[PDB]
DNA sequence: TTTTTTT
């Protein structure tokens, strides 16, 4: 299961179900032509208090190929800085 | 405080 690193922005974030997905940008240090979603869980999301992704917000992620898709497996805003969030 | 794969 290898890890990757990949930037993006939050597509979508809902806190009732405490997940969302991160549309990928770029991937490996390289911009992507066509974006692709990868999940995201509250648990892995680098920030104080309670954890949430706004819709749009950037981020910096690894993330791995998982059975029910990409899984982020750690999430940071730009430059390793803590989620925004709402 | 947050239904672990869709929006």
Same mark, same amino acid.
């Given at each position: 299961?290898?890890?990757?690193?990949?930037?993006?922005?939050?597509?979508?974030?809902?806190?009732?179900?405490?997940?969302? $997905?991160?549309?990928?940008?770029?991937?490996?240090?390289?911009?992507?032509?066509?974006?692709?979603?990868?999940?995201?869980?509250?648990?892995?999301?680098?920030?104080?208090?309670?954890?949430?992704?706004?819709?749009?917000?950037?981020?910096?992620?690894?993330?791995?190929?998982?059975?029910?898709? $990409?899984?982020?497996?750690?999430?940071?805003?730009?430059?390793?800085?803590?989620?925004?969030?709402?």
């Amino acid at each position: 299961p290898q890890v990757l690193r990949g930037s993006g922005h939050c597509k979508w974030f809902n806190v009732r179900m405490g997940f969302g $997905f991160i549309s990928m940008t770029s991937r490996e240090g390289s911009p992507l032509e066509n974006p692709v979603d990868v999940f995201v869980h509250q648990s892995k999301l680098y920030m104080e208090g309670f954890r949430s992704l706004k819709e749009g917000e950037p981020v910096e992620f690894t993330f791995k190929k998982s059975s029910k898709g $990409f899984e982020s497996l750690r999430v940071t805003g730009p430059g390793g800085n803590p989620c925004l969030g709402n």
